[PDB]
């Protein structure tokens, strides 16, 4: 069964709302498990309290750097890891996909698309989709800018698994 995970988002500490994601463990099990475990914190580390350091309106929200807090850091539950496959494409808003530094450099950083990002197909591993709370993602998006810097700090105040 494909797991469901949630982020509770805050804006400069003010609770905003919840975003939930279906993780496509049937197609990309290793990539899904990494995100799931980092979301629960069950390995002893993960996304809770980290920020979306880069948000570009009309494009995506990028987060998952819980080691350096600025996009330069990140670590998977495996100690980087391989691009599992490119079966799923960046088809529209709500797509959940891995940030990277080129081939086989998956860590913990990810992005939530707010539009179709077809130009990233074959280069970033898609592993989930927003299930509920796309309205919250759209609210987050408004705090971004062209260069990615956010006008208020957008944080994962809490995160975990629903199903």
């Amino acid at each position: 069964v494909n797991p469901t995970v949630f982020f509770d988002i805050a804006v400069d500490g003010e609770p905003l709302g919840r975003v939930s994601f279906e993780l496509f463990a049937d197609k990309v099990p290793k990539t899904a498990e990494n995100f799931r475990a980092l979301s629960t914190g069950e390995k002893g580390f993960g996304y809770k309290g980290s920020c979306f350091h880069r948000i570009i309106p009309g494009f995506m929200c990028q987060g998952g750097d819980f080691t350096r807090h600025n996009g330069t850091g990140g670590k998977s539950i495996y100690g980087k890891f391989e691009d599992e496959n490119f079966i799923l494409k960046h088809t529209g808003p709500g797509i959940l996909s891995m940030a990277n530094a080129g081939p086989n450099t998956n860590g913990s950083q990810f992005f939530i698309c707010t539009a179709k990002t077809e130009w990233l197909d074959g280069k970033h591993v898609v592993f989930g989709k927003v299930k509920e709370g796309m309205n919250i993602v759209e609210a987050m998006e408004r705090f971004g800018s062209r260069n990615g810097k956010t006008s208020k700090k957008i944080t994962i105040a809490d995160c975990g698994q629903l199903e």
Binding site: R54, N100, A101, F111, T117, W119, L120
Partner: peptide
């Protein structure tokens, strides 16, 4: 451009 990288953010 519009990229999602970890390390050098590019065009």
């Amino acid at each position: 451009x519009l990229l999602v990288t970890a390390x050098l953010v590019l065009a």
